[PDB]
Amino acid sequence: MREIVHIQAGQCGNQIGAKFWEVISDEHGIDPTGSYHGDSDLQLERINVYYNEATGNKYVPRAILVDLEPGTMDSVRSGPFGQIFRPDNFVFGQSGAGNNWAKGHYTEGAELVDSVLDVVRKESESCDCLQGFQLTHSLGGGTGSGMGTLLISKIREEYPDRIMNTFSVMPSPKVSTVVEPYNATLSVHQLVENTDETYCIDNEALYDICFRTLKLTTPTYGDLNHLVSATMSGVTTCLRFPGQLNADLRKLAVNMVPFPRLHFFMPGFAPLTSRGSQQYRALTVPELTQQMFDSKNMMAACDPRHGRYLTVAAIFRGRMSMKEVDEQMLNVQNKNSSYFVEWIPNNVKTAVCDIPPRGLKMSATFIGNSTAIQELFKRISEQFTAMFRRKAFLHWYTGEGMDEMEFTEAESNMNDLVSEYQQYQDATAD
Amino acid sequence: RECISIHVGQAGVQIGNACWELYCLEHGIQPDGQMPSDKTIGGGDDSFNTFFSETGAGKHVPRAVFVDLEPTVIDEVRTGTYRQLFHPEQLITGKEDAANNYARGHYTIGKEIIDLVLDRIRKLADQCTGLQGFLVFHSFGGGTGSGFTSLLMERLSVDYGKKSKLEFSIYPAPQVSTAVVEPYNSILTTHTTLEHSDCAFMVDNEAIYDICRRNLDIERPTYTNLNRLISQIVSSITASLRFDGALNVDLTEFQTNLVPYPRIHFPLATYAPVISAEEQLSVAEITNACFEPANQMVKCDPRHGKYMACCLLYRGDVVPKDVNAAIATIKTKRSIQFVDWCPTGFKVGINYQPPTVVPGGDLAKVQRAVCMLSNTTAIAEAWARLDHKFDLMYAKRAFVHWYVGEGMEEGEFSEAREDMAALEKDYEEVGV
Amino acid sequence: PEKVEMYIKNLQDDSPPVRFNAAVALGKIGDERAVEPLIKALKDEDWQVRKTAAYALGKIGDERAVEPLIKALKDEDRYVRSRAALALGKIGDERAVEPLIKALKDEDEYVRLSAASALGKIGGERVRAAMEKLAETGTGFARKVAVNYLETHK
């Protein structure tokens, strides 16, 4: 369990994926040419997780950049850290998926998928001991949704003993494309069956944090991705720096996933700021710990107080008292006892990393498996029902090879998932 | 990049030459096909080549085909003012007509001519770099309009799969009514064409007769009077496809925007201003008039239904701010009920080319005009009228023996009515 | 002559269909006085005014229009880009050869075609040289247009 293979699909996948590399490359002390120009020994300790060592002492990301739209190829390559990526690892079509899931999962996507698998096989070969896979994509579009979930299924039949982890960004009417609930319902059906750990990044919550908390009147995707990049930086901290707590993908999955299907995590970050917001008043351990479960700091549009936490992983970053952290994590559980499942002893795990993120003296990242995530799936189900009830625009999908049963199967699975969440929220130790 | 127009039977053929008269006038084309520097429209960029091929001479020829099982109606095209415009192979005629019998136009007599027609379309399709599809004109009530159109629609689906087929249908009226059995022919064509058409624009002969009497003051309107009006509305619908405009450019943009459920593809078109040449209307006035049942192509009450789509196509002296202001009042002031799952969005198109009227026609030249396309549940009222008339005669099996004796099975009547029942239920259920 | 002054002041007018009708008129008549006002209408707020000013500038032919039309191949509107490309083809100035070659890699089919047609209408020696280089070091549609031009020209 050493190397992680990263795959980024579609518009959303490549944009949020690129910001992740720009962020962790700075954290690991890598410039856009792949040369290490840092100071800490800790920076290169677990560098082999996300990078390959080539040339002299040059580091290359173990990243595969996919899209059916070739436009994305130039966007990322001409970008800030576009020169670190392997040129043979860009797999781009000339076609496009026109926001149709069936186009990415059956027609246009199924043609390019084997050329992608050729590249995944290439990177899996120069892997001493592969941990697993990490996919960044959007569930609202066509490529990231359809092709991305085809990739997930195709990888899982070839590499089943490897962990499949995803960063799935949820579509929202606030942000965006009428058949987004179809693309999101059809992808959630694949994720419930083919991933081990999924981070539910909701565009509704992303907009709301910018709008309500950050006071950004009409935010761009650059403002939303500023929350996504900082979240991804914190949730992958455990894997990137030397430690004991959730050191690898499987160890994290073992602690966070009590039930096969209940593997969708409500991500969170503290403190929250706007891009280039001239920093003022550094946070303390109690202020960090309080912003923990604070609904206003969640990246998924759910209230934690509307459900119970099955399991929790908390990551504190910077120079701070371990006794302060341990004291504040115990109070947050005793002063919120009812919101933590009684039948799962020691469900909250804490980790402290001495390395803080870029621009922040101290930060705190939170990964929660709360039964309250059913609120997100209910919202997609309602949006889906209204359209599928009348069988509206169904022919755009069914025309591209798909069957109506596939819509009924995805709807059944997503309704079942919500009922499962509720069954454990209502479950007592007695 | 290209569209083929098929004109079937008396109604379709007669409407076709009224359409083509207006298209020529709109794009600055003479009845011989010549487009000289004095008569050329002027303002560069022209996309009329979707409907007119260009000969080596500089002659613009309609990408049109005219079919009738009797020669009478097409003979008038061949001797008319536009005798020069169309090529002889485009105009196809039989000897014996379908005698207002669907089974003659679909089976017996229709089967004789179907193959030639297809090769004549093939001659046109072979002159297209990227054929988008077909525009089919026909009546519901004539044996050829009903029977041959459904037979051709069936064959075009096999011979041209991924090609759009948009219809312009002559819905019957008791006023201009040459047959008792028109309800039978109407239900039969709609049943067999439903799975083959992508979109269908009905023209209710009763509505145009009512519009001519009310708006144009014609005492007893003739086919000449109705047709000049039909072609005005039709031109406004097809303008998107012939001009360098942003809304409903190709046949796919038309389907995508207007039809969300496949079976429910009958948009109701309205048109304002319809003035007699005997006083200037603003953008607010003409937009408002689109939401008035009096100005509709088909008789129905939109206040009793739900919308799935709503497009406003303006032409002439129409300013962007005025259109936005007019739309804004219609959103806040009117009781326009849309279905839940679809957004309350009015797709707007503006072409600044002045309206072109028929010289010697009953219509006055206006500064601005508007053609609204609404996909409403209210169009089930048009189906209900027809279905009831059908049921009255069918229960006693009247006139049915004429159909069964012309290569048809009586069960096709029951099968047809069953499809109409389902179509009526679909409009009802979709509008909850 | 007496009416040319009128439409030049209608090109300035508040009303967008009036501005459109002024640009249609000045292309239909085509006077050297209308060059600079139609050059200003290439930067109009409305696409229907910009595209018809571009068509007018190509018909009239005046060399002063070559520069604003080169910038018009980069217009956000697909119809404006196609009309500007075709106008440059009508004028036939060799300064347009390279911007028209860059338009061969446009997202719109009509624009790509209009750029190909324009290049063929100019057909000097600099066009030929650029076609020779593009036929060997070129890709897809842009390569087909170089290869088709050199085969239509023995």
Ligand SMILES: Nc1nc2c(ncn2[C@@H]2O[C@H](COP(=O)(O)OP(=O)(O)OP(=O)(O)O)[C@@H](O)[C@H]2O)c(=O)[nH]1
């Ligand atoms: N508005 C309009 N309706 C017409 C016209 N000609 C016929 N109709 C109507 O169409 C129906 C009759 O069908 P037709 O088109 O004449 O018949 P056909 O397709 O030639 O078929 P056969 O009569 O069997 O040869 C009636 O409702 C007529 O009133 C016309 O030029 N315009």
Ligand SMILES: Nc1nc2c(ncn2[C@@H]2O[C@H](COP(=O)(O)OP(=O)(O)O)[C@@H](O)[C@H]2O)c(=O)[nH]1
């Ligand atoms: N937060 C975020 N959401 C995005 C981004 N790009 C697109 N989206 C969302 O993803 C959905 C559209 O999917 P997209 O990636 O563009 O399409 P694809 O290339 O076909 O997968 C919508 O819900 C958009 O709001 C991005 O950069 N950030």
Ligand SMILES: [Mg+2]
């Ligand atoms: Mg007849």
